[PDB]
Amino acid sequence: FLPATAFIDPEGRNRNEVERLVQQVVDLILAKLTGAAERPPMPETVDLPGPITIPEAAATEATLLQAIRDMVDGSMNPANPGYIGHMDPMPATMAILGDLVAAAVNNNMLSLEMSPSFSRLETLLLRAIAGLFGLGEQAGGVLTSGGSLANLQALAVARNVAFDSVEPGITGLAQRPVIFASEAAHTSLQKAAMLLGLGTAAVIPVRATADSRMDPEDLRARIDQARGAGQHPFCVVATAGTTTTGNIDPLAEIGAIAREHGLWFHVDAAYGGALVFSERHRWRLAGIEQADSITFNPQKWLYVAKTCAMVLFRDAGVLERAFRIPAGFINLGEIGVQGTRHADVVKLWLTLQHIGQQGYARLIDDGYRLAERVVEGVRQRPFLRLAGEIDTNIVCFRGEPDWLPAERWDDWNAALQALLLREGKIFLSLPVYRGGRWLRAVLLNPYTTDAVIDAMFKQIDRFAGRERG
Amino acid sequence: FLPATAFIDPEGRNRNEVERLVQQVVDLILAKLTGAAERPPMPEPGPITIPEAAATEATLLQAIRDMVDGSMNPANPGYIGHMDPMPATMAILGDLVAAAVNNNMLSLEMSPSFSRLETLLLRAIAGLFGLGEQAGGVLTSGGSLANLQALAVARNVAFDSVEPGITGLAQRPVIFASEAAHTSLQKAAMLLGLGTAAVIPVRATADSRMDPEDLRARIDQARGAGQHPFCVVATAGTTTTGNIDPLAEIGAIAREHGLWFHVDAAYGGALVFSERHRWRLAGIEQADSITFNPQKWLYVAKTCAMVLFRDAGVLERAFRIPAFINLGEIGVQGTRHADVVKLWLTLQHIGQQGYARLIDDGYRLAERVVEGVRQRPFLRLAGEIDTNIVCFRGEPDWLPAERWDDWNAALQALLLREGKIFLSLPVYRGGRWLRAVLLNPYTTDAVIDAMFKQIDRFAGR
Ligand SMILES: [Cl-]
Ligand SMILES: [Cl-]
Ligand SMILES: [Cl-]
Secondary structure, eight states, X not given: OOOTTSSOOTTSXXXXXXXXXXXXXXXXXXXXXXXXXXXOSSOSOOOOOOOOOOOSSOOOHHHHXXXXXXXHHTSOOTTXXXXXXXXXXXXXXXXHHHHHHHHHHOOOTTXXXXXXXTHHHHHHHHHHHHHHHTOOTTOEEEEESSHHHHHHHHXXXXXXXXXXXXXXXXXXXSSXXXXXXXXXXXXXXXXXHHHTTSOGGGEEEEOBXXXXXXXXXXXXXXXXXXXXXXOEEEEEEEEBSXXXXXXXXXXXXXXXXXXXXXXXXXXXOTTGGGGGGOTTXXXXXXXXXXXXXXXXXXXXXXXXXXXXXXXXXXXXXXXXXXXXXXXXXXXXXXXXXXXXXXXXXXXXHHHHHHHHHHHHHHHHHHHHHXXXXXXXXHHHOTTEEESSOOSSSEEEEEEOOTTSOGGGHHHHHHHHXXXXXXXXXXXXXXXXXXXXXXXXXXXXXXXXXXXXXXXXXXXXXXXXXXXXX | OOOTTSSOOTTSTTHHHHHHHHXXXXXXXXXXXXXXXXXXXXXXXXXXXXXXXXXXXXXXXXXXXXXXXXXXXXXXXXXXXXXXXXXXXXXXXXXXXXXXXXXXXXXXXXXXXXXXXXXXXXHHXXXXXXXXXXXXXXXXXXXXXXXXXXXXXXXXXHHOOTTTOSTTOSSOEEEEEETTSOTHHHHHHHHTTSOGGGEEEEOBOTTSOBOHHHHHHHHHHHHHTTOEEEEEEXXXXXXXXXXXXXXXXXXHHHHHTTOEXXXXXXXXXXXXXXXXXGGGGTTGGGOSEEEEOHHHHTOOOSOOEEEEESSTTHHHXXXXXXXXOOGGGGSSOSSOOOHHHXXXXXXXXXXXXXXXXXXXXXXXXXXXXXXXXXXOTTEEESSOOSSSEEEEEEOOTTSOGGGHHHHHHHHHHHXXXXXXXXXXXXXXXXXXXXXXXXXXXXXXXXXXXXXXXXXXXXXXX
């Protein structure tokens, strides 16, 4: 037996039933999103669900709607204006609808024939985005399900170019291939190094400054040291928007050092790459136009529903030469880590069009303005300290109250994070950084106002007043 | 500037405007899907500019219309060529729900309902495969990534490579797989630093099933050639012909030689939902890892795929990098779309009874194609069929063999152009073959009978 609405009949025979079911789900979702501020940024404690059994018989539409209601009510809620803790934003309206459209036609990015109206669009759109990064006329890339895959693919190509490893692999080598990255760079570099057969220890950390920016003098020292240890450097990764503090490495200096030493220059701009849409702020990315490859994630600061990420190459032909396996448009499955892929280009393209470059410029500038308000508040309070200068709309800071022993500060900041969430409905993350627990604000929600930040500080001050501070 | 409906205001202030925009898209999609048979199975640009100023809602709706009209259309009952099905209704709705709450499978904190659900659900599915009480796995964006992760683990267990990597080995690590296995194995071998040449092909039979004798043999030969075997991959539903390797025999050989046993059940894994057909997978229960893709024969909108391990702990031991488990720590991806929502809602809506029905109807339709091919001397089967996939071709005796590829290509083009029936045309055994994948639940006997009528008319000219 099959339920009457298990599939949509292509000759209309269950139209009314399908329309009714779809409408109930759409109405539920619209009620939950237009009323998202009625739910806290994080859900009430879970209740530990028990073993799952796959049912024999079809579930009723009533059961399915209750399931959806429960999954929404139990989910994280970045649409709450007090959600200010992670690089996970509320989705653009056209990103929600773009996924509805993509799931409905259910095409496959594996090949042109399986995605005739999406494949060429993706290739053309990513050439246009590469132009915004200034990479030049040979540039292009592919969409990937997440920035970790984009980093994996960039590093795979860097490895394959340096060691000609597509067919014979790298097991024959007598010196260990190594890459350099900031001590503040993302752990997907180590995951990638493991996957690529380099091992996690192949990612050599470079000292970051007090402002969490890679130190070019230490990069030189580490490169010299690796060669002296008989290692084989092949890539430098600069990070444009570090995860914890949102800082941007000095891309032009790092790139110049990579080029002097013949190393592939990869820029992980997962977060900070969005600045290419801001006339006012994109100078921070100066030097990125010379990258050999760039990772960029519209699912972070371009508000595209997860996942949406890409890897761009200054010479797209490199994917043919040093990636694609042995056998004018190239089937995208041949030149990505994935074969079959969801049509993320639909939500990306609809969202880019709906918001426009000028809309992102507004979002980004307002993000900076809110971050600056947080910085101001932190600076004026002796008991709160910044992790360092900020380069994006992210502020990492913590209490260092001089009336408590330093040994107690982690507990203090943890208790503060919990109180802000439980009583203020304001969510900050609490990363481990420099051996301690720090608070972290990521000012992404378009509906977070100055008043939310003011309310945060009022609660922080009241908490700080408890133990005689 | 930002248009008023760019986001949904969480305090309700743009509700009417957002509702109207969403309803326009929903109405368009419903019209195109309930009228999908009005579009053929396959459809009939210059540079792209990212606009400075927001596009109008008119422009956006026209873009959606054009994208849909220009898309491949597996919902047409004549679409019978690929393992790409029309999606289940709840899978479409499940992705609407997933995108709306926009949670992140990277960590429990960022997906507090969805993470535990995924873990528990994949334990239940591992149960259907008979993998035992330590089994578990992760959802992955596609079966290629599932295969990559299984082979990464296999490599890491054999060579202790998480931290030091695999450079400086005296012997080349190698993987055995059928000559008919999926090319994601070669892509994975390349990514893993093993090289595409590390995938050693094993002979397949006339029915495109791995030959165990050839395997046992290849293993002996590789050790003789200084190579270091560490994994055997059996395929349960090969891509071109849909055949299933003899899993029990392949597995016995892998265990005799201490090799990781991976089963790529991307397509044929769905048989665990059929009491009538799951005997075909006998032996899969002993696998160290399984790849399975609900996005194929369980009708879940792409992507939806998983890798299962008989011992889930192996992911902590031989995958997770040095400092409930946050899922990002034990998958190739970090951040991931919440595929579990579409999977769970679809499984609940259709049920195992529903899939048992869909699967046996696929077999019945495939058997009708098989009978049609047997009755015609000019049409030849590739071999026996194991799943609802039939690969066949014209070998007309009144035509020189060097003209058969063109004859089959012309037939495929004609079936599509005049019949609105889509078969794929793979290269197989160095020639062009037709390939039927009988997945659309609305494909009927009448469609198959119509294809054969058209084939006969083509053959009589
Ligand atoms: Cl300070
Ligand atoms: Cl996805
Ligand atoms: Cl035959």
